Amino acid sequence: ILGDEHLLGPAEYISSLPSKGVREAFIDGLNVWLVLPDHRVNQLKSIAQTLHNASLMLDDIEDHSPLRRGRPSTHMIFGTEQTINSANFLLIDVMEKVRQLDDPRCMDIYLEEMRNLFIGQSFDLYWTRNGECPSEEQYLDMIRQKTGGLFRLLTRMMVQIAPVQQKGLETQLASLSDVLGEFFQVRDDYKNLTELDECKFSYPLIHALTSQPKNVQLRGILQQSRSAGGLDVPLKETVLSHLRQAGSIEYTEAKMGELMEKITDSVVSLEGETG
Amino acid sequence: ILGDEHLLGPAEYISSLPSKGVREAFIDGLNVWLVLPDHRVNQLKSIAQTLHNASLMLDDIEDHSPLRRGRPSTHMIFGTEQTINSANFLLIDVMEKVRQLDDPRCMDIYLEEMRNLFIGQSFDLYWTRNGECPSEEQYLDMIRQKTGGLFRLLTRMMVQIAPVQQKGLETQLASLSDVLGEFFQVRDDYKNLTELDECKFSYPLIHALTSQPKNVQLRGILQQSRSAGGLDVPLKETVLSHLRQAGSIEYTEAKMGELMEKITDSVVSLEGET
Amino acid sequence: LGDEHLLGPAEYISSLPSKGVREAFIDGLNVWLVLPDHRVNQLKSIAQTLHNASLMLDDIEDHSPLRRGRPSTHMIFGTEQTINSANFLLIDVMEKVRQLDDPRCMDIYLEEMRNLFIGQSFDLYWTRNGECPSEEQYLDMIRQKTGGLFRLLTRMMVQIAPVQQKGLETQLASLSDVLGEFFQVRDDYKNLTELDECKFSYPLIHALTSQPKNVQLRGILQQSRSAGGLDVPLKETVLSHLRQAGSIEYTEAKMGELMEKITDSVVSLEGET
Amino acid sequence: ILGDEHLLGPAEYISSLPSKGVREAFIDGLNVWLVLPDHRVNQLKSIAQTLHNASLMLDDIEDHSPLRRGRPSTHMIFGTEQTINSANFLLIDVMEKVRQLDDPRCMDIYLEEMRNLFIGQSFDLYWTRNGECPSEEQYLDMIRQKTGGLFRLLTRMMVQIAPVQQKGLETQLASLSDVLGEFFQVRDDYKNLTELDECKFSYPLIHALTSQPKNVQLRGILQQSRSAGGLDVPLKETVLSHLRQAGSIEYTEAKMGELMEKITDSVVSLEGETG
Amino acid sequence: LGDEHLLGPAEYISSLPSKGVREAFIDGLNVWLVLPDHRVNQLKSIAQTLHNASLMLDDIEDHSPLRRGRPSTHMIFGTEQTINSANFLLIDVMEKVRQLDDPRCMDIYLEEMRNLFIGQSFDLYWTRNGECPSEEQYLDMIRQKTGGLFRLLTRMMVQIAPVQQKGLETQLASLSDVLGEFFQVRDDYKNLTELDECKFSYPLIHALTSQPKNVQLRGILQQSRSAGGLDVPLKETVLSHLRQAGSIEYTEAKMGELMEKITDSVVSLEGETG
Amino acid sequence: ILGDEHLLGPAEYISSLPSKGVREAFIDGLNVWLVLPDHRVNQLKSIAQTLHNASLMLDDIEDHSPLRRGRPSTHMIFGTEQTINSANFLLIDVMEKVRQLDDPRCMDIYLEEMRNLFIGQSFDLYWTRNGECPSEEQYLDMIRQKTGGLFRLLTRMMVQIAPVQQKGLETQLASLSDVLGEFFQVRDDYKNLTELDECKFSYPLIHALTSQPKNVQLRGILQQSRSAGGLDVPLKETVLSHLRQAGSIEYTEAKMGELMEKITDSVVSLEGETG
């Protein structure tokens, strides 16, 4: 008995799709400050890759997206249950990968970071399903964990196995990672209306729903999206019109600029500390 | 501030349900041969309970079961996505518990038997999706990992923390765990049959399909179940009648008796030396 | 490549319990027509196969999940396989018809099959479009659709009949039509007194004709047409609407009138023979 | 009642649609060798037309095809029940036409050939519904019976009708008809692929599933087709790419060439014992 | 040209078993106001037509297959025909009100219809969007929706009343509002102890307000919204959740206070009338 | 609480979509003969606008049309129940506008006209639901009330408000309004065909079904529309071809020419009476 082809199928399929390598680029860009050996960097890149693949496999299912990068999703080639099983086993694979790093504290780092990531994802799922619009503070503290959790996990693990010296700069890099994840989430939200069908809240939408508590048209359109399975294109342009009248797209520009200013200042401070 | 109300909701709901507790009884029975402190036994009981709860939560979404033990399933109270999120987090939660047993080898054991469990469940899911009837050996090898995986996982950790002396009692206990896992699945198939909707293969239904290669009615009802999504009572009666013509029920009785003979022999051999 | 997938549905529907009206009718005719024993069994085989094919097609065309409290053929083998088996059954019945050593039997078979299909086509058109037929139209449709098998069997038995049996052609055919009409009226009475697809019946036509402005009945019938079936309270409402108009007594009167004709025809045939 | 109008409705609608006259071409082609009178030729052509119309009318129902030759199918204008009824009556009509050929053996030929046609159809339906992949030999036999059945029936009736003399060239023409029907089916399978929706097995698909008994992606896509009752375009492109990766499109062009060589040799042989 | 297809849905719901709360209320008020039988019958017809139109619209807007154990109007005539008939019923009532020989009755009718529709609009918004109203909001909604007809009839009866009974306006209006609140709370209690369209109620509002972290109840309410209603095991779970927070006792308390107010108002009116 | 947010939500939305002002132009047209003060004309225009908005709100629901003038429909933003409630209350709104005209005979004209409007709508709905083809006369009477009711109502109110000297016209103007409504309905029927997805009976379709009792294809396509829910485009071309072969379009432009001739004669007579 040497067959493990119905368990590794979805993982290989999702790993065969094209990607931008943002996490690999982040690992490489953090390696200048923390001079690490090559094989450790390859191990960290592998861990990040498989964790991202598992997250994508789960999110495809939980968002009912027939297409991923123009190509078919994993659950339309293998089924929902097999994809769920493979995603569950990917956690054990990342477990063996982290075990191979020869560091007892990477254990606790991995476990705590996964706990935070799951908390964030649970809050996002509750808000999406129950149709409850969160506040700006709640939404922004959600995306510090759901999206910035991977960056914080990789940063802490990278700092742990770095050669001594670079130990007091963990907090600076953790703050940088949180700001970076916030920037990615807000950028995604922006380049999705000026470019969801499953009633996903966004940064532009919260401002519109808060500054206008009496706007019944937007709320009714969102309710139709909820109890319809999605919106048609003419119903979609109405949401864009409402957001553009409420001035939420510029409110997103303000946040984008503030986050980039914070990123630039953090990077400048980190370069000043090191060198 | 920090409540974790939407993460632990499904876990608490499924943990607040009635249960038979076969895993806890197995642990307590093993504790006689391998003398252990209460603290370690309770830790292992918690680990087994959490793993069983996660497995139960996952196999209701994958089987489309509206009810469990007469009560509504977890995904009908919280949602499919939230239940999946909690089930995956429970794996990490147990991961933090195997680490508190103070043994590096326990994590290896965990990481190997979880792999075996996932392989078995993947094969079961593939046979359910694509209606491919496995051989009897294939089915028995699947259920030696899908169902006996928990028992083996608990057994190999208990001998690792067992105080010195008893160390050669490893192969016999593993064989006992595998035979118990096989018996507990043949028994469930027999009880479910003699007392379909998801079109899941069973031990009698493989013998029926193998001994009768030209039974078109059975193969057609099995496909109507798959396509329509479920079988009405008259169709279930037709399947049950087709299964008595091939003598599949007696074939299940014989396998149950043969398995129980192995269990008795294993117990007598283990109690002979210790 | 055998016929496991071709004779599956036919063998399944043959295995199911049945009543045996056709075989009893053949045996009853054999008293007058004194056929040899082998030919009687051949005709019973033909009648059984034709009836089984008709039931197989009607189950699909009426969306009936059950037959005699047992799963229907197309819920075990599928719609396409059942249609293919029903077509092969028609192909097979004639190979038996050609074994009766009579060229005229083929002509009889072909003409009565044409009549069968015409009647069934009118039934299907009335059901799909929701158009209520008149009394004469419905009576002719049930005279061809249900009385056609009896006619076919009667004419073949008279052709095979040993010599004589010259004038026993119009009387026996009229008896066949009357029996086929009576069976349909009796089934229509039974299915209602003690379906979901809004199938027109003798009680329903009288109600829809005698009451030109009964909006409630037509609305319930259209609800059955659209939703796909009548729940229990709507069925009770329809039955109350039928009791109000007196359709049940009309059906009883029609049954009695038909049985009078059956009795008179039997007495006449007994008188000559 | 005497109006036979709800019975011939579908039969005339399917006849009004455009066609290609392959069966008429076959009859003209064999008439050079068998030289039988003109009215018999018209009778045989009408029999072939009616049988083909009935087969198409039933196929369109059994394959859930909303369109036929661009125009709507028969069951979308008259309903499934009426279409089935008309297709059932068309057999009896063809049967009335056969008896006018004035030959008792013609009825025997017709009754024996329709049995093979129905056996082939039954195997096709069983393989389609149950999702069971046939072997190459079984598929070739099925398409030899299902598709070559009409050609075999016509060519066996033609020799019986044709003026005595020529009687020994019956087996040769039957082999020619079987090869021609197999060629037609393989050509249709290749064209539909290069230029499956209702889970139909083809010649390239069997080769793909047999050469690689580990490709879980192809099997999963085939399953998804069954579950959803059809395939989307990105999903179909994946199947086409998988087939082109296994060399099935060339394994089909080899079979087509072999069949054409067999057809040419059969025609040459049949032209050497006539003239 | 010949009516029908318009009055048919109206006649179907008119010829159905009823209770007659509105008619009894009119007869009870006539003791204090004393109106000729002609006017009383006119008001009774107006009330019957208004109640029937409200029921026809509510059955459509709640997807109720049955009413009083008999099929609903829209299940015999279709949604569109029922809507058209209910619309024409308002014009018909507008014709009856014009026959009371008073221009002020028309103003009363037009100013109570607006309140009725405002309350119904808030109910529809809360039902569709899943928003949970506050106790004050819910009690203000049912004071206009269910207490609208009682107030409308009351204010017409005191305008036609002979010997212009001075005052007897505010007291009777308050009596109508408290009766309308009592009837809705009573119906809410009866439906629970003795939803499928996800309608809110006093016990459910109390349960959702007292326990802001009960994720199970909110999840079940969301499941009701998604899959078009609940099932018996899930309704039992909701009932068990409501008996833990003391919602039923809260409903008894509200019912008792409402009945005390009714008794006090009635005795106050009887003291001055005699 | 002030309220009036979920009541005047669909009414304001339907009043914001672009319109053509046919009924406002009609009101201005008759104001030349009936010299009325400006504010009385504005009141009548408000009444007509709100009545038309309520009718459109109701009609969109009974036709399951997701789009109105390209923009999303009212029941796709507020739901069916809320739109029904607002349309119900719009009648009570037109009530006070009519009462503000200061004329006891205008509350009477209103009720009788709305009764005929509802009778016509009821017949339209019954024919649409229970698959019943009306005759030519029944269809013409139904469209004289369903469509010409608003014109008659506005005309009678305008005559009542106008000075007593110009009150002998009425009849003339009422006949003009009936012919105008018939022309509008026939124009819409012609334009929806030249340019049954809800199985609606039009003027050409009644002729097509009446002049051809034995045409089974048209009735089958209509029943397919009834059952499935709508007609695909290849099925629409079949209906169009059947109508063209039946010569039903020329019947329609003959009807339009006759109606325009009647309108011209009526206007000429009305100008001859006045002046």
Residue D69 marked ligand-binding: yes
Closest CA to B98 of B86, B108, B88, B87: B108
Cβ contacts of F220 on chain D, cutoff 8 Å: 9, 77-79
Tell whether D75 is within 8 A of chain F (Cβ). Answer: no
The answer to whether A9 contacts chain D (CB < 8 Å) is yes
Residue F74 C-alpha, separation from nearest chain A C-alpha, in angstroms: 10
Chain E interface mutation, best of A64, A130, A214, A215, highest count of E Cβ atoms under 10 Å: A130
For A68, which DSSP code?
Answer: E
Work out the burial of residue F270: count CB atoms within 10 Å of its CB; fewer than 13 is exposed, 13-18 middle, 19 or more buried: middle
Strand C70-71 with C66-67, pairing: antiparallel
Q: Does A have 3 or more CB contacts under 8 Å with E? A: yes
Q: Hey, are the CB atoms on F114 and E91 less than 8 Å from each other?
A: yes
Reading the block at residue E82, the tokens are: 């029922």
Phi, psi of C11, deg, nearest 5:
-65, -40
Chains in touch with F (≥3 Cβ pairs < 8 A): A, C, D, E
CA angle C231, C235, C241 (to 5 degrees): 150
Among the partner-chain residues D5, D70, D79, the one whose CB lies closest to the CB of F220 is: D79
| Two structure tokens written together for E11 | 């006649």
Round to whole Å and give the CA distance between B31 and B29: 5
Experimental method: cryo-EM
Tokens of F37: 């003060």
| Cβ(D218)–Cβ(D208) below 8 Å | yes
Residue D109 CA to its chain's centroid (Å): 18
The CATH number of C8-101 is 1.10.600.10
- What is the experimental resolution, given in Å to one decimal place? 2.8
DSSP class per residue in A101-160: T--HHHHHHHHHHHHHHHHHHHHHHHHHHHTPPPPHHHHHHHHHHHTTHHHHHHHHHHHH
Instruction: Tell me, yes or no, if E63 comes closer than 8 A to chain F by beta carbon.
Output: no
- CA angle D149–D153–D157, rounded 5-degree value: 170
Strand partners, A67: A72
F219 annotated as a binding-site residue: no
Give how far E247 is from chain B: nearest CA, Å: 21
Reference C121, options C108, C137, C105, C136; nearest CA is C137
Whether C29 and C44 have beta carbons less than 8 Å apart is answered as no
Write the DSSP string, C185-245.
HHHHHHHHH--TT----HHHHHHHHH-TT-HHHHHHHHHHHHHSS--HHHHHHHHHHHHHH
Domain boundaries, chain D: 9-102
Q: Do the Cβ atoms of D69 and D56 come closer than 8 Å?
A: no
Q: Which residues make Cβ contacts (< 8 Å) with residue C137, sequence separation at least 6?
A: C122, D1
Chain E residues near residue B78 by CB distance under 8 angstroms: 215-216, 219
Cα nearest neighbour of B127 on chain A: A6
The CATH classification number of B139-274 equals 1.10.600.10
Backbone angles phi, psi at E53, to 5 degrees: -65, -40
Chains that touch E (3 or more CB pairs under 8 A): A, B, C, F
Kindly determine whether residue F216 and residue D72, on different chains, have CB atoms separated by under 8 Å. no
**F192 interfaces chain D, CB cutoff of 8 Å:** no
Which residues in chain C are closer than 8 Å to F129, comparing Cβ atoms? Answer: 222
Question: E5 and C215 in contact by Cβ < 8 A?
Answer: yes
The answer to whether the beta carbons of residues D110 and D147 sit under 8 Å apart is: no
> CB of E225 within 8 Å of any CB in chain A?
yes
HEC-encoded secondary structure of chain D: CCCCCCCCHHHHHHHHCCCCCHHHHHHHHHHHHHCCCHHHHHHHHHHHHHHHHHHHHHHHHHCCCCEECCEECHHHCCCHHHHHHHHHHHHHHHHHHHHCCCCHHHHHHHHHHHHHHHHHHHHHHHHHHHCCCCCHHHHHHHHHHHCCHHHHHHHHHHHHHCCCCCCCCCHHHHHHHHHHHHHHHHHHHHHHHHCCCCCCCCHHHHHHHHHCCCCHHHHHHHHHHHHHCCCCHHHHHHHHHHHHHCCHHHHHHHHHHHHHHHHHHHHHHHHHCCC
Confirm whether residue C254 is marked as ligand binding: no
The whole-angstrom distance between B16's CA and the closest CA on chain E is 12
Fold adopted by B9-102: Farnesyl Diphosphate Synthase (1.10.600)
CATH topology of domain A17-273: Farnesyl Diphosphate Synthase (1.10.600)
Q: How far apart are CA B194 and CA B251, in angstroms?
A: 13
* Residue indicated by tokens 């503030």: A258
| Cα–Cα distance for residue pair F202/F190, rounded to 1 Å | 8
Rounded to 5°, angle at Cα E258 from E252 and E260: 105
Instruction: Report how far residue F186's alpha carbon sits from residue D128's, in angstroms, rounded to the nearest whole number.
Output: 51
Residues A136 and B130: their CA atoms lie apart, in Å, by 46
Contact B234 C12 (CB under 8 A): no
Q: How far is E27 from chain A (nearest CA, A)?
A: 43
- C to A contact (≥3 Cβ pairs closer than 8 Å): no
Give the chain F residue whose CA is nearest to the CA of A216: F9
Query: Which of B64, B69, B76, B80 to probe by mutation at the E interface, max E CB count within 10 Å?
Result: B76
Q: Which two tokens stand for residue B249?
A: 């029920």
CA distances from B161 to B103, B157, B172, B207 (A): 8, 7, 17, 42
Q: What are phi and psi of E165, to 5 degrees?
A: -55, 110
Taking contacts as CB-CB distances below 8 angstroms, the residues of chain E near B75 are none
Specify the 3-state DSSP secondary structure of E214: coil
A/D interface, count of CB pairs below 8 Å: 29
Locate D144 and state its tokens.
Answer: 């030899």
CA–CA separation, C31 vs C20, rounded Å?
18
Nearest-angstrom CA–CA distance, C94 and C50: 10
What's the number of CA atoms in the CB half-sphere (13 Å) around residue A150? 26
Q: Which of residues 228-257 of F touch A (CB under 8 A)?
A: none
Contact E163, E92 (CB under 8 A): no
Q: Do chains D and E touch (3 or more CB pairs under 8 A)?
A: no
Q: Which C residues, 120 through 149, put their C-beta within 8 Å of a C-beta on chain F?
A: 125, 128-130
Chain A and chain F share a number of CB contacts under 8 A equal to 30
D142 CB neighbours in chain C (<8 A) are 1
- Inspect the interface and report whether the beta carbons of F129 and C218 lie closer than 8 Å: no
Question: Amino acid letter at D111?
Answer: L
DSSP, residue by residue, B129-151: HS-PPPPHHHHHHHHHHHTHHHH
C-beta of residue B142 within 8 angstroms of C-beta of residue B120: yes
Residues of B in contact with E231 (CB under 8 A): 66, 72
Quick one: how far is CA A55 from the chain centroid?
Answer: 8
Q: Provide the Cα torsion E82, E85, E87, E92; round to 10°.
A: -160
Nearest to E25 by CA among E165, E140, E146: E146
State yes or no: A147 annotated in a binding site: yes
Q: Do D67 and F214 touch (CB under 8 A)?
A: no
What separation in angstroms does the CA of B250 have from each of A275, B200, B203, B244, B245? 79, 20, 11, 9, 11
Residue E67 φ then ψ, to 5° = -145, 120
Beta carbons of C155 and C108 less than 8 angstroms apart: yes
First-to-last CA distance in chain A? Answer: 55
Q: Does B67 touch chain E (CB under 8 A)?
A: yes
Q: Residue A25: count other Cβ atoms within 10 Å of its Cβ.
A: 10
D66: contact with F, CB 8 A cutoff = yes
The Cα of B99 is separated from the nearest Cα of chain A by a number of Å equal to: 9
Question: Which pairs from B249-258 meet CB under 8 Å and 24+ separation?
Answer: B249/B190, B249/B193, B249/B194, B249/B204, B251/B203, B251/B204, B251/B207, B252/B186, B252/B189, B252/B190, B252/B193, B252/B203, B252/B204, B253/B190, B255/B186, B255/B203, B256/B183, B256/B186, B256/B187, B256/B190
Contact E176, E143 (CB under 8 A): no
Answer whether D122 sits within 8 Å of C98, measured CB to CB: no
Question: 10 Å Cβ neighbour count for C188?
Answer: 22
Calpha distance B191→A192 (Å, rounded): 53
C63 reaches B (C-beta below 8 A): no
Which amino acid is it at C225?
A: R
Helices B171-194, B203-211: inter-axial angle, 10-degree rounding? 70
Chains that touch C (3 or more CB pairs under 8 A): B, D, E, F
Q: Touch between chain B and chain D (3+ CB pairs, < 8 Å)?
A: yes
Please tell me whether F146 is known to bind a ligand. Answer: yes
Contacts of C75 in chain B (CB under 8 A): 224, 235
CA distance C74 to C62: 12
Same fold, B9-102 and B139-274: yes
Chain A residue closest in CA terms to F11:
A217
Q: Using the beta-carbon criterion (under 8 Å), do C215 and E77 form an inter-chain contact?
A: yes
d(CA F195, CA F190): 8
Interaxial angle between packed helices D38-62 and D80-99, expressed in degrees from 0 to 180 and rounded to the nearest 10: 160
F132 Cβ partners below 8 Å, 6+ apart? Answer: F126
Q: What is the DSSP string of A15-50?
A: HTS----HHHHHHHHHTTTS---HHHHHHHHHHHHH
Q: Please give the Cα distance from A144 to A181 (Å, whole number).
A: 6
What count of Cα atoms within 13 Å lies in the side-chain half-sphere of residue D257? 6
Concatenated DSSP letters of chain F: ----SSSTTHHHHHTTS----HHHHHHHHHTTTS---HHHHHHHHHHHHHHHHHHHHHHHHTTT-SEETTEEPGGGTS-HHHHHHHHHHHHHHHHHHHHTT--HHHHHHHHHHHHHHHHHHHHHHHHHHTT----HHHHHHHHHHHTTHHHHHHHHHHHHHS-TTS-S-THHHHHHHHHHHHHHHHHHHHHHHH--TT----HHHHHHHHH-TT-HHHHHHHHHHHHHSS--HHHHHHHHHHHHHHTHHHHHHHHHHHHHHHHHHHHHHHHHH--
E170 is in an annotated binding site: no
Contact between chains at B224 and C75 (C-beta distance less than 8 A) = yes
| Count of CB pairs separated by less than 8 Å, A with B | 94
Within chain E, residue ranges assigned H as helices are: 8-14, 21-33, 37-62, 74-77, 79-97, 103-129, 135-145, 148-160, 170-193, 202-210, 215-226, 232-242, 247-273
A6 touches chain D (CB under 8 A): yes
Asked if residues A53 and A90 have their Cβ atoms less than 8 Å apart, the reply is: yes
- Nearest CB to B118: which of A7, A61, A118? A7
Classify residue B78 by its DSSP letter: S
Query: CB-based contacts of C120: which residues, under 8 Å, 6+ apart?
Result: C145, D85
Tell whether F221 is within 8 A of chain E (Cβ): no
Give Cα B117 to chain centroid, integer Å: 9
Rounded CA-CA distance F179/D122 in Å is 63
